[PDB]
């Protein structure tokens, strides 16, 4: 339903921002049951909550110039 | 603020317990004469100083 507790708890567990927490859209009913940080750590270990990588900011042109 | 005195904190505790809604059984006891607490204050609308 409304997943803002899971998006907030997974950001502090993964030590990232809310813009990096990826919640699986197919298992929104399973993530909705996670109400504690210990259950989020169980979902991160199962691939349902993955930390998205950093946006690329290559210094190729900065170093080539 | 976060730095309170004991007298101020004791004053905010009473105003916090006075802001509770009227019990449901009071309404049936008075026959809907006292339906709502006429002294309910909002933290944005009414300031206690």
């Amino acid at each position: 339903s409304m997943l803002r507790l899971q998006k907030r708890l997974a950001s502090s567990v993964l030590r990232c921002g809310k813009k990096k927490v990826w919640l699986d859209p197919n298992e929104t009913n399973e993530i909705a049951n996670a109400n504690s940080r210990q259950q989020i750590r169980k979902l991160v270990k199962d691939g349902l909550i993955i930390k998205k990588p950093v946006t690329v900011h290559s210094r190729a042109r900065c170093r080539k110039n | 603020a976060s730095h309170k005195t004991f007298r101020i904190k004791r004053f905010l505790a009473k105003k916090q317990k006075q802001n509770r809604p009227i019990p449901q059984w009071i309404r049936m006891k008075t026959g809907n004469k006292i339906r709502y607490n006429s002294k309910r204050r909002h933290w944005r609308r009414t300031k206690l100083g």
Binding site: - | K9, R10, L12, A13, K14, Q16, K17
Partner: protein, 51 residues
């Protein structure tokens, strides 16, 4: 902290390591009595009727 520690040693006969007092926002003081390791808080809570 000395009165609370001495009271629980008499009401229930249990030794306390330390006490952490705290006045709740509604004006009531709340204490956190940590029992000695020789006593178990789960057994004391069942005797005095907490659980």
């Amino acid at each position: 902290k000395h009165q609370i520690k001495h009271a629980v040693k008499k009401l229930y006969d249990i030794d306390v390591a330390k006490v952490n007092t705290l006045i709740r926002p509604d004006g009531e003081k709340k204490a956190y009595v940590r029992l000695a390791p020789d006593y178990d808080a789960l057994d004391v809570a069942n005797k005095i009727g907490i659980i």
